[PDB]
Amino acid sequence: AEKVMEIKLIKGPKGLGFSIAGGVGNQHIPGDNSIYVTKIIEGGAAHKDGRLQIGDKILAVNSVGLEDVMHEDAVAALKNTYDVVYLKVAKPSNA
């Protein structure tokens, strides 16, 4: 049983307010074909609203699964969203 948390991102003037990494095709994570965060905008939207930092893994956004495709398609998953978009992330706890 892993922990599950939601991350809200506001579509402010900067957009999502962060960056994503794709494991499929354009593998950014050393050993993972999912999505991971790579950059956060200083309290832009994802950082301030989402409170997410480089190292978190996205397992879904709102109702879209951007955790089984390349970094590019994942971007489409985020951009396709609206004002506030919530992401679902789970932290791996070692016992």
Swiss-Prot record:
Q: Which residues form the PDZ domain?
A: 6-92
Q: In which tissues is it expressed?
A: Expressed in brain (at protein level). Detected in juxtaparanodal zones in the central nervous system and at nerve terminal plexuses of basket cells in the cerebellum. Expressed in cerebrum. Expressed in hippocampal neurons (at protein level). Isoform 1 and isoform 2: highly expressed in cerebellum, cortex, hippocampus, and corpus striatum.
Q: Which residues form a coiled coil?
A: none
Q: Where in the cell is it found?
A: Cell membrane; Postsynaptic density; Synapse; Cytoplasm
Q: What cystine pairs are annotated?
A: none
Processing after translation: Palmitoylated. Palmitoylation is required for targeting to postsynaptic density, plasma membrane and synapses. Palmitoylation by ZDHHC2 occurs when the synaptic activity decreases and induces DLG4 synaptic clustering. Palmitoylation by ZDHHC15 regulates trafficking to the postsynaptic density and function in synaptogenesis. Palmitoylation may play a role in glutamate receptor GRIA1 synapse clustering. Depalmitoylated by ABHD17A and ABHD17B and to a lesser extent by ABHD17C, ABHD12, ABHD13, LYPLA1 and LYPLA2. Ubiquitinated by MDM2 in response to NMDA receptor activation, leading to proteasome-mediated degradation of DLG4 which is required for AMPA receptor endocytosis.
Subunit annotation: Interacts through its PDZ domains with ANO2 and NETO1. Interacts with KCNJ4. Interacts through its first two PDZ domains with GRIN2A, GRIN2B, GRIN2C and GRIN2D. Interacts with ERBB4. Interacts with KCNA1, KCNA2, KCNA3 and KCNA4. Interacts with LRRC4 and LRRC4B. Interacts with SYNGAP1. Interacts with ASIC3. Interacts with SEMA4C. Interacts with CXADR. Interacts with KCND2. Interacts (via first PDZ domain) with CRIPT. Interacts through its first PDZ domain with GRIK2 and KCNA4. Interacts through its second PDZ domain with the PDZ domain of NOS1 or the C-terminus of CAPON.
Q: What's this chain's function?
A: Postsynaptic scaffolding protein that plays a critical role in synaptogenesis and synaptic plasticity by providing a platform for the postsynaptic clustering of crucial synaptic proteins. Interacts with the cytoplasmic tail of NMDA receptor subunits and shaker-type potassium channels. Required for synaptic plasticity associated with NMDA receptor signaling. Overexpression or depletion of DLG4 changes the ratio of excitatory to inhibitory synapses in hippocampal neurons. May reduce the amplitude of ASIC3 acid-evoked currents by retaining the channel intracellularly.
Domain remarks in the entry? The PDZ domain 3 mediates interaction with ADR1B.
Q: What is this protein called?
A: Disks large homolog 4
| Biological source species | Rattus norvegicus (Rat)
